[PDB]
Write a protein that binds this DNA or RNA. Sequence first.
RNA 1: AAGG
RNA 2: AAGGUAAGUAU
RNA 3: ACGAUACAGAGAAGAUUAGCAUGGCCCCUGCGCAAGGAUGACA
RNA 4: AGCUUUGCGCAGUGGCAGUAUCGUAGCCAAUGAGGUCUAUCCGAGGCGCGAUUAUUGCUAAUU
Lengths: 76, 146, 97, 80, 48
Amino acid sequence: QKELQEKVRLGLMPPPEPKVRISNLMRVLGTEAVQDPTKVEAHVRAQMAKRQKAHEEANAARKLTAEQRKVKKIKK
Amino acid sequence: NDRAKVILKPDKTTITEPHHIWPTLTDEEWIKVEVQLKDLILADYGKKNNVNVASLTQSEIRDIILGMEISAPSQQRQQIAEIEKQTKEQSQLTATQTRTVNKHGDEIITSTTSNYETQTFSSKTEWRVRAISAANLHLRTNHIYV
Amino acid sequence: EESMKWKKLTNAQRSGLNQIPNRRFTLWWSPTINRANVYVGFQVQLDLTGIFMHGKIPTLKISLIQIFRAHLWQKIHESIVMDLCQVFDQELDALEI
Amino acid sequence: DYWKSQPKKFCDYCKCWIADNRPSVEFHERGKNHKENVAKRISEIKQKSLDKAKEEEKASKEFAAMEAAALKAYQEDLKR
Amino acid sequence: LYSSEPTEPYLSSQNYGELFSNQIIWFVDDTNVYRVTIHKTFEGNLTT
RNA sequence: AAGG
RNA sequence: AAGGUAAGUAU
RNA sequence: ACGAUACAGAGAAGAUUAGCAUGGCCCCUGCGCAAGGAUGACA
RNA sequence: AGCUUUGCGCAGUGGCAGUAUCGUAGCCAAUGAGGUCUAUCCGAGGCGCGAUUAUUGCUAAUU
């Protein structure tokens, strides 16, 4: 956390945008949600899908190959 | 009402099912439709209020879209705000000399700069008002009761 | 007064905040406490105001200072004078002014 | 009944507190005392700058002399 | 000292965000309960 | 700015 | 006789 | 040596305000690490 | 070949509580911390001190 804060303050990293959900949509951007409801909904869902995609990519990237699963099992 | 109906159907291809009140538009099309409707609302508010839609802030736009009414303060309310608040950046640029008395009852001539009791009463007899009153006096000349 | 009741404050701050009920009580009955018949003595004219204090009633003086802030007395006099000016301007011909 | 204290301005030159509005500030600044204090402050700033310059040149001279003496001592110790 | 009836919570432009909760809300409008239609005839008469 |  | 001084900045 | 004048005068109150993320706790889900449990399958 | 248990990470979603969360080149502690109930029985941290908007950051306003 300290490293991320130092990166943000130093300018190497952009500041973190607020996390927004469906229940959090109005509380974060009520002024923007009134003028453009569908656009704000699309932006919020895009952020949520980006978070989910990052989670899946992290999980899958670090996944034992099917042959590698056997290699661990064939060795133990 | 009339323009909004035309906006709700950009093309004759767009149709409404008998059991749906609103047109069946895709998720992306609704963004453009909402933008167009917001532009309608802002433009008509500007037309009715003689203001430009560019200078309206996000909070003002939200208030316009909602039912919140930004009513212009009355002439009485404008005067109340002036009295209720201290003079804005009061500048004592004008000095007035009046004949007064001191705390010991001695007649004295004092020069004062505080901007109180300095309002000017523009009367109907003051020549400054009557000068512009006599301007364009030929309007009364065309219509006569001979 | 309600908001400050539940805030972290020092003893002096809370002691100062317990006087508002007394100030309200004093100004409610001010035309009675602030009398020359009640407090026999000299009069002191409140600054920026036409109010005479017949005694040091700081509980009343503090709340009278707020009411006549921003030169309210002068503004009232000026507004009344201006309104009478418009009244007499509207009746120039009828009153032969 | 909420008490709002009027803003107050502190004149550093005269070391006094005045009301923070255009009339009072301009009246104070236009006064003789404020002008005298400003002139005195400018004179003191100039005097302090000149004194600091004299002190730093004296310190540079003293350090140069001490460095020369130390270099001579180190040289004669090396030759020993 | 106050004269007007005590003010109750009102749906304003500030608490508008609080409206979007998971609880059930209803919007009751009686503007169009008694409704009439008038037409302006070219003769200057208007009908109801 | 004026007074002892 | 008091418990009744506003704190000032200018001239 | 006050006071008179001209100016200011609210002459007694961090009155602050929302959003998000961290942190605590408790599950749930996915992935990795290290161990292990129980069971099924004909020539 | 699947299934599944425990512990440790890494994330995601969700819920709860801000009279509490940490820090320990301070001290004591399974060679027993701490014991109102069950005591020839219970078995783990306790104490002192320090930090604080009863964890801490940014962001947006007013300033």
